[PDB]
């Protein structure tokens, strides 16, 4: 009965988008208004045991009054003969449809000190072109790990910003600038290792990698601000999008493409580009033992990237579909929310892995390649 | 027996030798080649028509075929002995001879110091002007404003490649960055050049849509730019030019039909990069012009100003991109065999880096056309309506 009224509201929503005349739009909105009023009186199979006078059955009923109110606004535009305006008011209904632990701080700090220690070891031992990318990656990793105490304290006050709205934009962007600079230098490292594997034959690339990181962190500086979430009654540092569902889905999609898809394309093309070349050699003696060892070092950098960043990017794509209206079951939406800070920690863990993948096995890679 | 038709025969049978399983199949293709090579030695190149037959240019041409016939006879000696794998290996050596021909019959000392300086003086300016846009959006905090950001980002990435080309041109076209960078930076250049053009189009459609009166368009514009830069990614590679002793980053088309590919790709550059975009820019301008001329004394001053802003974006596009696209169409006809005057061909080559620079200059103009007159367009449009 509840799935039968929401199917009607979601069916006609698609109709409004594919409609060309205002008579088509008014017809779908009339079928919606009736279904919204008919759904307002029904009890869902999740709250079928619940009482009608409960505070849960005070706000969820109020939610429909908002939905009917938004349908009437769209109806007023359609009756005036305003297709583009009534179709725009229908996009606001999508946003209404979507609206319908001590271990975490300890874990943020334990990986902070470790990551700072292993990366301060890289900067000091370094103190070649490949070695110039190691320094920059170690610097970008060090600055990213340095922001961990801030997010640990932010979570200790259960999502509360007490540092200022300027710090929300400044430290918010600084986080994104170094996260991308770390990802984009991992890519440089994979392209260089591939270039050396094929042919044994950098003051422009390093400033470009920082410029691309500055550009990719501009929506972070444009949207991040201290806001009051009326739902929880708290002051949080969030992406203050204009009146919102479209922007959250669009930005979630940009996080995956620039931060995982495009980088992983490169990491994977370089690994299989190194695997194909070293397989065409056909080694038999101790060279078969040597080629396998080189291949293991090539396999490690691509496998460590997907172990550290795939859990978070999977959660981000699932969240994007929620704002689109694909996934609507609140039970599944709650799981994404709970798992999110553990997925965010794996991203920071990649900075602890990096010294072992490139610097600590740097000399070994070149010596075993010049051998085969 | 027209040299080009003789090369088609030599290249056709080369493919036959590779797909052949018996020595009788190989000897048959080599016999057809030997005849075609002898028949091409008596022919005059479709550009050396003016030059005498005893000239040193005509001497190396007839000599290049004596090498080619000599290599065919070596392969024939193997095929007659019943040596398929050996005759097929000798056929791979003909490929090296055919490539030494196409480099010559299809200089770097045309160098000017002015070109690298001009590439840098517009790089810093463009970068500065585009950063100003990015920073002013930051200071400020619309759908149109979301296309300004993307266009500025595309422009910034395109300008960032100018030091690579001002350096490549300075080493008389000797690529010292690596063959991987030739594919990577070659495609990156094309990806952002199209993304800049395709977002100019979005901006003109939006300004027209508002004059009469999105989270899907921006990713599609980048996807269309990715697709349009696939022939650059597939063909850009470092190739050795033995004549100059210089490794150059060039479009490595199959030498089997190299002239056909250069003409076909030159035409794709004009349709996707100028014709289709210009159709939209021009339809939107005259679409806006038709709306303001319909629907005064005091109210004519304001409408004229709005039309001047509409006229600027279409006129700046043809000033920046028409010189290069004209040169590209003239070059396509050279590959076809239409224009054969080396005097006229030399002019295209000399003018081309300057017509290339105008394309990059469009990125310096863009901040003045959309961001710096952004507020003015909306305030004067909400006035007339
Ligand atoms: C190495 C992990 C990096 C990382 N560290 C984080 C640390 C803390 C927070 N959280 C949640 C949290 C958990 C514990 C305490 O708080 C925050 O409250 C928060 C506050 C201010 C700024 C930023 C985040 C999330 C992340 C988080 O998602 N990430 C990943 C990440 C980052 C930015 C972008 C990004 C990229 C392009 C365009 C826009 C954006 C963006 N996303 N949010 N704003 N801007 C994409 C992925
Ligand atoms: C904003 C101007 C953009 C621009 N910058 C360029 C910068 C440098 C070079 N030149 C010549 C030069 C001059 C000075 C120093 O070197 C190069 O040597 C060169 C080297 C590697 C990659 C590319 C170009 C040319 C151009 C150049 O023609 N263009 C215009 C352009 C670009 C690509 C395409 C294009 C579109 C669809 C399919 C295929 C292609 C294509 N063309 N060449 N490869 N791929 C069409 C027009």
CATH label of the domain that carries residue A8: 1.20.120.10
**Can you tell me the distance from the alpha carbon of A29 to that of A93, in angstroms, rounded to the nearest whole number?**
11
**Can you tell me the distance from the alpha carbon of A255 to that of B187, in angstroms, rounded to the nearest whole number?**
23
Neighbours of A285 (CB within 10 A): 7
Rounded to the nearest angstrom, the minimum Cα separation between A234 and chain B is: 23
Asked whether the beta carbons of B122 and B364 are under 8 A apart, the reply is yes
Which of B325, B188, B327, B328 shows the shortest CA–CA distance to B262? B328
Residue A221 to residue B180, Cβ atoms within 8 A: no
Across the interface, of A198, A208, A221, the residue whose CB is closest to B160 is A208
**Residues 6 or more apart in contact with residue B270 via CB below 8 angstroms:** B325, B328, B329, B332
Which of B100, B80, B78 shows the shortest CA–CA distance to B89? B78
Asked whether the beta carbons of B154 and B216 are under 8 A apart, the reply is no
Q: What is the enclosing helix (H) or strand (E) of B247?
A: strand B246-251
Assess whether A178 and A257 both reside in one domain. Answer: yes
Report long-range pairs for A9-15 (Cβ below 8 Å, ≥24 apart).
Answer: A9/A35, A9/A36, A9/A39, A9/A93, A9/A97, A10/A97, A10/A325, A13/A90, A13/A93, A13/A94, A13/A325
Torsion of CA A342, A348, A352, A356, to 10 degrees: 100
Q: What is the enclosing helix (H) or strand (E) of B160?
A: none
Eight-state DSSP code of residue B273? I
- Tally of structural domains, chain A: 2
Hunting for tokens 């006035």 — which residue is that?
A: B383
A194 contact B CB<8A:
yes
- CATH number for position A310: 1.20.1070.10
Hunting for tokens 């901006």 — which residue is that?
A: B203
Q: Resolution in A, one decimal?
A: 2.9
Residue A218 to residue B184, Cβ atoms within 8 A: no
**Residues 6 or more apart in contact with residue B320 via CB below 8 angstroms:** B358, B359, B361, B362, B365
Identify how the structure was determined. X-ray
- Find the residues whose C-beta lies inside 6 A of ligand 2: B 158, 165, 168-169, 186, 189-190, 193, 228, 231-232, 236, 249, 251, 265, 268-269, 273, 353, 356, 359-360
Q: Could you list the residue range(s) of the whole structural domain that residue A179 is in? A: 103-370
Which of A58, A69, A85 shows the shortest CA–CA distance to A36? A69
**Residues 6 or more apart in contact with residue B287 via CB below 8 angstroms:** B208, B211, B212
Eight-state DSSP code of residue A260? I
Rounded to the nearest angstrom, the minimum Cα separation between A216 and chain B is: 9
Which of B169, B126, B119 shows the shortest CA–CA distance to B362? B126
Backbone φ and ψ for A229, nearest 5 degrees, come out as -85, 100
Eight-state DSSP code of residue B178? -
Asked whether the beta carbons of B253 and B99 are under 8 A apart, the reply is no
Nearest CA owner, ligand 1 atom 16: A151
Please give the structure tokens belonging to residue B345. Answer: 């061909």
- Ligand located closest to A222 CA: 1
Q: Which residues pair with B238 in a beta bridge?
A: B249
Backbone φ and ψ for B249, nearest 5 degrees, come out as -85, 100
**Can you tell me the distance from the alpha carbon of B385 to that of B383, in angstroms, rounded to the nearest whole number?**
6
Rounded to the nearest angstrom, the minimum Cα separation between A298 and chain B is: 18
Which of A76, A94, A87, A93 shows the shortest CA–CA distance to A24? A87
Asked whether the beta carbons of A308 and A346 are under 8 A apart, the reply is yes
| Rounded distance from Cα A316 to ligand 1 centre (Å) | 11
**Can you tell me the distance from the alpha carbon of A188 to that of A206, in angstroms, rounded to the nearest whole number?**
9
B139 contact A CB<8A:
no
Contacts of A218 in chain B (CB under 8 A): 134, 137-138, 149, 153
A81 contact B CB<8A:
no
Assess whether A87 and A154 both reside in one domain. Answer: no
Of A100, A128, A155, which marks where a domain is finished? A100
Asked whether the beta carbons of B321 and B362 are under 8 A apart, the reply is yes
Rounded to the nearest angstrom, the minimum Cα separation between A221 and chain B is: 7
B156 contact A CB<8A:
yes
Assess whether A40 and A154 both reside in one domain. Answer: no
To test the pocket of ligand 2, the residue of B165, B226, B267 to mutate (highest count of ligand atoms within 8 Å of its CB) is B165
Please give the structure tokens belonging to residue A52. Answer: 């009608």
Question: B239 by DSSP, 3-state: which?
Answer: strand
Residue B149 to residue A221, Cβ atoms within 8 A: no
Length of chain B: 385
Please give the structure tokens belonging to residue A14. Answer: 């698609």
**Can you tell me the distance from the alpha carbon of A334 to that of A336, in angstroms, rounded to the nearest whole number?**
6
Nearest CA in chain A to B146: A219
- Ligand located closest to A215 CA: 1
**Can you tell me the distance from the alpha carbon of B203 to that of B278, in angstroms, rounded to the nearest whole number?**
13
Asked whether the beta carbons of B366 and B309 are under 8 A apart, the reply is no
Assess whether A160 and A83 both reside in one domain. Answer: no
Question: B256 by DSSP, 3-state: which?
Answer: helix
B301 contact A CB<8A:
no
Q: Which of B178, B182, B212, B220 to mutate to test the interface with A (most CBs of A within 10 A)?
A: B178
Assess whether A73 and A166 both reside in one domain. Answer: no
| Rounded distance from Cα B250 to ligand 2 centre (Å) | 10
Hunting for tokens 């239409």 — which residue is that?
A: B338
**Can you tell me the distance from the alpha carbon of B129 to that of B119, in angstroms, rounded to the nearest whole number?**
16
Asked whether the beta carbons of A231 and A59 are under 8 A apart, the reply is no
The crossing angle, in degrees rounded to 10, of helices A56-79 and A22-39 is: 160
Neighbours of B106 (CB within 10 A): 15
Which of A173, A103, A108, A106 shows the shortest CA–CA distance to A352? A108
Assess whether A231 and A262 both reside in one domain. Answer: yes
Ligand 2 atom nearest the C-alpha of B164 is: 15
**Can you tell me the distance from the alpha carbon of A352 to that of A109, in angstroms, rounded to the nearest whole number?**
13
Report long-range pairs for B169-174 (Cβ below 8 Å, ≥24 apart).
Answer: B169/B111, B169/B115, B169/B116, B169/B119, B169/B353, B170/B116, B171/B246, B172/B108, B172/B109, B172/B111, B172/B244, B172/B246, B173/B108, B173/B241, B173/B244, B173/B246, B173/B248, B173/B249, B174/B246, B174/B247, B174/B248
Q: Which of A80, A204, A323, A324 to mutate to test the interface with B (most CBs of B within 10 A)?
A: A204
Residue A211 to residue B153, Cβ atoms within 8 A: no
**Residues 6 or more apart in contact with residue A168 via CB below 8 angstroms:** A161, A224, A225, A226, A237
Length of chain A: 372
Contacts of B183 in chain A (CB under 8 A): none
Assess whether A95 and A118 both reside in one domain. Answer: no
Ligand 1 atom nearest the C-alpha of A104 is: 14
**Residues 6 or more apart in contact with residue B282 via CB below 8 angstroms:** B314
Asked whether the beta carbons of A130 and A363 are under 8 A apart, the reply is no
Assess whether B202 and B294 both reside in one domain. Answer: yes
If contacts are CB pairs under 8 Å, which of residues 229-288 in chain A contact chain B? 246-247, 249-250, 253, 257
Assess whether B81 and B128 both reside in one domain. Answer: no
What is the CA B371 to chain-centroid distance, rounded?
Answer: 29
Which of B282, B310, B283 shows the shortest CA–CA distance to B380? B310
Which of A362, A314, A370, A320 shows the shortest CA–CA distance to A339? A314
Assess whether A204 and A353 both reside in one domain. Answer: yes
Of A45, A67, A100, which marks where a domain is finished? A100
Asked whether the beta carbons of A211 and B160 are under 8 A apart, the reply is yes
Q: Which residues pair with B250 in a beta bridge?
A: B237
Assess whether A366 and A311 both reside in one domain. Answer: yes
Assess whether B122 and B258 both reside in one domain. Answer: yes
Nearest CA owner, ligand 2 atom 46: B269
Of B105, B121, B142, which marks where a domain is finished? B105
Rounded to the nearest angstrom, the minimum Cα separation between A204 and chain B is: 8
Angle CA(B158)–CA(B161)–CA(B164) in degrees, nearest 5? 160
């Amino acid at each position: 009965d509840l799935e039968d009224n929401w199917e009607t509201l979601n069916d006609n929503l698609k109709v409004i988008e594919k409609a060309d005349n205002a008579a088509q739009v008014k017809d779908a909105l009339t079928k919606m208004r009736a279904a919204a009023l008919d759904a307002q009186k029904a009890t869902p199979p999740k709250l079928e045991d619940k009482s009608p006078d409960s505070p849960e059955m005070k706000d969820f009923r109020h939610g429909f009054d908002i939905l009917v109110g938004q349908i009437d606004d769209a109806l007023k535009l359609a009756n005036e003969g305003k297709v583009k305006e009534a179709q725009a008011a229908a996009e606001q209904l999508k946003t209404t449809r979507n609206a319908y632990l001590d271990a975490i701080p300890i874990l943020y700090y334990i990986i902070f000190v470790i990551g700072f220690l292993v990366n301060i070891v890289v900067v000091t031992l370094f103190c070649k072109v490949s070695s110039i990318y190691i320094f920059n990656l170690a610097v970008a990793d060090l600055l990213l790990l340095a922001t961990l105490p801030l997010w640990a304290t932010y979570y200790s006050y259960r999502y509360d910003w007490l540092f200022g709205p300027v710090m929300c934009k400044v430290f918010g962007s600084f986080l994104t600038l170094n996260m991308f600079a770390s990802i984009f230098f991992i890519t440089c490292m994979s392209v260089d290792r591939y270039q050396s594997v094929i042919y044994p034959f950098a003051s422009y690339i390093v400033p470009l990698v920082w410029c691309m990181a500055c550009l990719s962190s501009l929506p972070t500086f444009y949207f991040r601000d201290v806001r009051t979430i009326e739902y929880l009654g708290v002051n949080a540092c969030i992406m203050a999008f204009p009146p919102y569902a479209q922007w959250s889905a669009g930005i979630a999609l940009m996080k995956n493409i620039l931060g995982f898809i495009i980088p992983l394309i490169f990491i994977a093309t370089c690994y299989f580009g190194i695997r194909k070349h070293l397989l065409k050699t056909n080694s038999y003696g101790k060279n078969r033992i040597t080629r396998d060892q080189v291949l293991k070092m090539a396999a490690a950098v691509v496998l460590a990237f997907i172990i550290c960043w795939l859990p978070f990017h999977v959660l981000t794509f699932l969240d994007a579909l929620a704002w689109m209206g694909v996934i609507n079951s609140c039970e599944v939406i709650a799981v994404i929310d709970l798992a999110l800070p553990f997925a965010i920690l794996l991203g920071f863990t990649n900075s602890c892995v990096n010294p072992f993948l490139y610097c600590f096995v740097g000399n070994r890679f070149q010596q075993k390649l010049r051998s085969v």
